[PDB]
């Protein structure tokens, strides 16, 4: 029996491959050959934030485009005013090994988690002036790799178990358990309209998940190695994925296929974060060799380098107003670029 | 106008946070973090929900022991969280060829580009309970054992037969082969024979964590 299902699976896989090949009527690098190159994008280290004791593992900008959360394995979340370098709060974590953070579209709540298998939802705007854990979402059977708010009420979380979950924070229960990945779902990014998200995993696949239906809509398979990072293109119709294969790739949901590969032969280091500028035109990728490289998303060509980190860039984030790029690193500093 | 009031309030909150973080920096720097990683965890813990935490002190030195439970077997993504522990405490049972699997896990721990600069304190546990090996299968899984004499630098405790002083030293030689062949100056491996009853292993953890920190400082002064 099992061999019959293997053969049928291979037949469907070759159907999908043939369909993709038939629908690859053009190539992106050829369609946009005449677009004007961006020249060189020399970004200034306009602020450096020096609060964390240990390696920063995640950071996230608020919708206000001014405040950021940063999470470090010292067990502190720090909320930074990027206009002033002032720390607004620092929050002690019950487990020092945080691996993800997120900050709600309202700015009321901040999320964090890591090897504790728990997502911790902190309230920043409680009247008591302290910051206290509003909920500990604990039904995960492995480390939390990413967290992203859909609203103050709902958080999607990604695990080192092969599953993601949509949590209702007041219920404390996972209302859906997106299941079908075959490895650790390292990275998570929500669509600009929060009806879909795409998750990138240690099976070289990224999968597009319907938050309301819970089904897996599409599997994108081009990568050679673990997808450490994923980000939607601000249109909601494409996303980019970074991998240990030292490549970023741009996937289009409606073409169902890889439109571009971003690589350079002197890059052997894996990608640790990917984000897009507000136009989408620039892809910013963080790398293991303590650098960030900025890519023309429509040309697959380099545009600039954010140097001056001492150690692995762990998190990268572009403000919603597009004004600045944050880059956290194992050097324990956030550097904000503009 | 309110801009000055806001700036003053924000700077006061910042000063409180600076005070807290500066106070916690000394506690973080004083506490040695240890990753406990089993390929005999009870023997190496009882004598000294996700990640699990044992917090203890030796000679007023704070040690913080982290056991990675309820994580799936694919270590490659989470183990990078521990590039800044003082030691990876690798407990291997003398005891599938669990020695080979433990040894390949240790080789991967050693060579991984982020886990360099983390030393390994290698407790060969259960060296009584199975390594007594009084059978009238180390010889079967490791055929090169037939060519290995017990070393001249062997320092036994009596009551262990030469069968055990062969077995345990051969296993140590295998781990030290992995250690020596691919690491110099940046990370060190401290083998320790240990047993289900043999307590005061915590003292050897302390002694080798101290050695790690001493070697770090000598490394910074460029003296080694």
């Amino acid at each position, epitope marked *: 029996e099992l061999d019959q299902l293997r053969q049928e699976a291979e037949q469907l896989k070759n159907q999908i491959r043939d369909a993709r090949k038939a629908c690859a009527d053009a190539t992106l690098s050829q369609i946009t050959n005449n677009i004007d190159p961006v020249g060189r994008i020399q970004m200034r280290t306009r602020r450096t934030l020096r609060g964390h004791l240990a390696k920063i593992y995640a950071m996230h900008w608020g919708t206000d485009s001014r405040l950021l959360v940063s999470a470090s394995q010292d067990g502190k979340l720090i909320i930074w005013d990027s206009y002033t370098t002032n720390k607004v709060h620092a929050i002690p974590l019950r487990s020092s090994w945080v691996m993800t953070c997120a900050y709600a579209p309202s700015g009321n709540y901040v999320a964090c988690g890591g090897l504790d298998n728990i997502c911790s939802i902190y309230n920043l705007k409680t009247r008591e002036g302290n910051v206290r854990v509003s909920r500990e979402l604990a039904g995960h059977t492995g480390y939390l790799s990413c967290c992203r708010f859909l609203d103050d009420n709902q958080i999607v979380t990604s695990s080192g178990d092969t599953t993601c979950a949509l949590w209702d924070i007041e219920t404390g229960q996972q209302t859906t358990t997106f299941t079908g990945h075959t490895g650790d779902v390292m990275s998570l990014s929500l669509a600009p309209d929060t009806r879909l998200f795409v998750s990138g995993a240690c099976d070289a696949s990224a999968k597009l998940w319907d938050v309301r239906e819970g089904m897996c809509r599409q599997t994108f398979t081009g990568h050679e190695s673990d997808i450490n990072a994923i980000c939607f293109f601000p249109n909601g119709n494409a996303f980019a994925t970074g991998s240990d294969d030292a490549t970023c790739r741009l996937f289009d949901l409606r073409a169902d296929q890889e439109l571009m590969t971003y690589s350079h032969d002197n890059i052997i280091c894996g990608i640790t974060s990917v984000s897009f500028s507000k136009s989408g035109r620039l892809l910013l990728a963080g790398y293991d060799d303590f650098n960030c490289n900025v890519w023309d998303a429509l040309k697959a060509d380099r545009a600039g380098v954010l140097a001056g980190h001492d150690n692995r860039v762990s998190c990268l984030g572009v403000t919603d107003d597009g004004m600045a790029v944050a880059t956290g690193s194992w050097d324990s500093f956030l550097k904000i670029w503009n | 106008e309110d801009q000055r009031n806001e700036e003053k309030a924000q700077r006061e909150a910042n000063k409180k946070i600076e005070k807290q973080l500066q106070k916690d920096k000394q506690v973080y720097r004083a506490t040695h973090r240890l990753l406990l990683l089993g390929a005999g965890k009870n023997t190496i813990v009882k004598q000294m929900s996700g990640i699990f935490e044992t917090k203890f002190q030796v000679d007023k030195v704070n040690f913080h022991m982290f056991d990675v439970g309820a994580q799936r077997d*694919e270590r490659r993504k989470w183990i990078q969280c521990f590039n800044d522990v003082t030691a990876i405490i690798f407990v291997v049972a003398s005891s599938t060829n669990r020695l080979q699997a433990a040894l390949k896990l240790f080789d991967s721990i050693w060579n991984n580009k982020w886990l360099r600069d983390t030393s390994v304190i290698l407790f060969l546990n259960k060296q009584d309970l199975l390594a007594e090996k009084v059978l009238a299968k180390i010889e079967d899984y490791f055929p090169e054992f037939a060519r290995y004499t017990t070393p001249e630098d062997a320092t036994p405790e009596p009551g262990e037969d030469p069968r055990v002083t062969r077995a345990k030293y051969f296993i140590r030689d295998e781990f030290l082969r992995i250690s020596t062949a691919s690491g110099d100056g940046r990370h060190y491996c401290y083998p320790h024979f240990t047993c289900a009853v043999d307590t005061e292993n915590i003292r050897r953890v302390f002694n080798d964590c101290r050695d790690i920190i001493q070697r770090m400082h000598l490394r910074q002064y460029e003296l080694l």
Partner: nanobody
Amino acid sequence: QVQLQESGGGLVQPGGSLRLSCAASGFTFSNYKMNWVRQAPGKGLEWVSDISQSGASISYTGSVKGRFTISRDNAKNTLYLQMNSLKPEDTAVYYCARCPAPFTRDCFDVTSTTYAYRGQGTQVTV
């Protein structure tokens, strides 16, 4: 997709010789070390042999040293495991397994029941 497909005879006499081959696809074969893993009936997976990027660094599990011989053909994305004097204990499903990351020296790939980057296996029975 990253794909590995093993081949090699399901049944053989004791003392026989056999050759496994794995066709690799979807990854830059020259960049990744390759491992062989096996699963005996009712037991966990165990590492059998490994081969570095160039085929320079090679090692074996001790019950296999000299009885098998590993080689890799970087020209055709093909990994081989030669077998001689197959013993009853070598009766297993044999899985081809790839290091998770290019250019690295480490691997974490024996993980039972779950791992990408590892093939469907070919039976050997003695």
